[PDB]
């Protein structure tokens, strides 16, 4: 059908894809009609320029007409910076173009430069044209984290030497996450984490105590994930929510502690073996040094949900001894809907009653 060029604005989506697999080719164009007409020529010469021949906030890539008379076969290498949604941090991908002219009695396929000058099909003149984008292979791998990388192509629509049509704005969204470091991180502890309750006697009997232990959930992905489903558990599920130390030795002889969570900005009373399901939105975050569980590496510091878990105990008449429990706290980031794994740490709590 015939079409007049002219601005345009487009969307796409990529993904989502997970940072544990090489990216594959990502189509944003494919052979899109740009410009045709049956009767007259002046689309014989369509050409496309972005706005900067080096600045890559909409993409970079030749910005004038190509001044050969020589036809570029091939594809323009374009450079457009991406800035992930919640860090803000920047960084550039390739995005390759090319064109392709329609002819009314014969055919002449080749992909053109975006910049190229135009040519005649068995000395026919165009009638019109098409656009083809594409992300190559293996492009996202170069990115540092999870997260929502957006850009917004910008490329100018052309007669070569000759009228501006527009310009059209492309829209692109990737969804890159990052599954196998989804996790619940610790800043001092980089495995088996353990707190003392830090009991002291206060005479009549009576034992206080109260500790912390830092922590951070990551969802691989930018703390883009709208809600979290969190929870805190123990060894000893005596099914009344409360959690207990066991004393080394004497199995029968427990000792109450509670827990408490700032969880981003947000006090919340965790007990034992209930979950919790919080809305992200509200929530604060913070940037951590968060490394990889295994693979892929995350290069940079990354945003995260923090959260301080304090532990208190006041205990009345304990035995004398070492008490030991187990926390398993498990975490489990929001999804569209896929539906992620959960992840979980364990944190060894001690406590000694000590009279002396």
């Known amino acids: ?131 083809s984008l594409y992300i190559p292979a293996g492009e996202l791998n170069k990115l540092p984290f999870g997260g929502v990388w957006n850009a917004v192509l910008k490329l100018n629509v052309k007669r070569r030497y000759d009228t501006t049509y527009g310009t059209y704005t492309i829209n692109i969204t990737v969804n890159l996450t990052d599954k196998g470091n989804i996790q619940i991180w610790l800043p001092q502890f980089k495995s088996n984490a353990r707190v003392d309750l830090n009991l002291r006697p206060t005479g009549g009997g009576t034992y206080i105590g109260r500790n912390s232990v830092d922590m951070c959930f990551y969802d691989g992905y930018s703390t883009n994930s709208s809600s979290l489903e969190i929870r805190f558990q123990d060894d000893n599920s005596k099914s009344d929510g409360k959690f207990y130390l066991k004393k080394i030795n004497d199995d029968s002889k427990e000792l109450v502690y509670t827990l408490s969570l700032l969880l981003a900005g947000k006090n919340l009373t965790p007990t034992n073996g209930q979950a919790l399901n919080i809305n992200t939105a509200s929530l604060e975050t913070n940037w951590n040094r968060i490394t990889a569980v295994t693979m892929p590496e995350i290069s940079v510091p990354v945003l995260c949900w923090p959260g301080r878990l304090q532990l208190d105990a006041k205990v009345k008449n304990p035995e004398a001894g070492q008490y030991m429990g187990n926390i398993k706290i498990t975490f489990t980031p929001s999804s569209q809907t896929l539906d992620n794994k959960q992840v979980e740490k364990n944190i060894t709590v001690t406590a000694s009653v000590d009279p002396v």
């Open 1 to 131: 059908a015939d079409k007049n060029p002219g601005s345009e604005n487009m969307t796409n989506t990529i993904g989502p894809h997970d940072r544990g697999g090489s990216s594959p080719i990502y189509n944003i164009l494919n052979s899109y009609l740009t410009a045709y007409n049956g009767s007259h020529h002046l689309y014989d010469r369509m050409s496309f320029l972005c706005l900067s021949s080096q600045n890559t906030l909409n993409g970079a890539c030749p910005s004038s007409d190509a001044p050969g008379t020589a036809t570029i076969d091939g594809e323009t290498n374009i450079t457009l910076q991406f800035t992930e949604k919640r860090s803000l941090i920047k960084r550039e991908l390739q995005i390759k173009g090319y064109k392709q002219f329609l002819f009314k009695n014969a055919n002449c396929p080749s992909k053109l430069a975006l910049n190229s000058s135009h040519f005649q099909c068995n000395r026919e003149q165009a009638s019109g044209a098409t656009l």
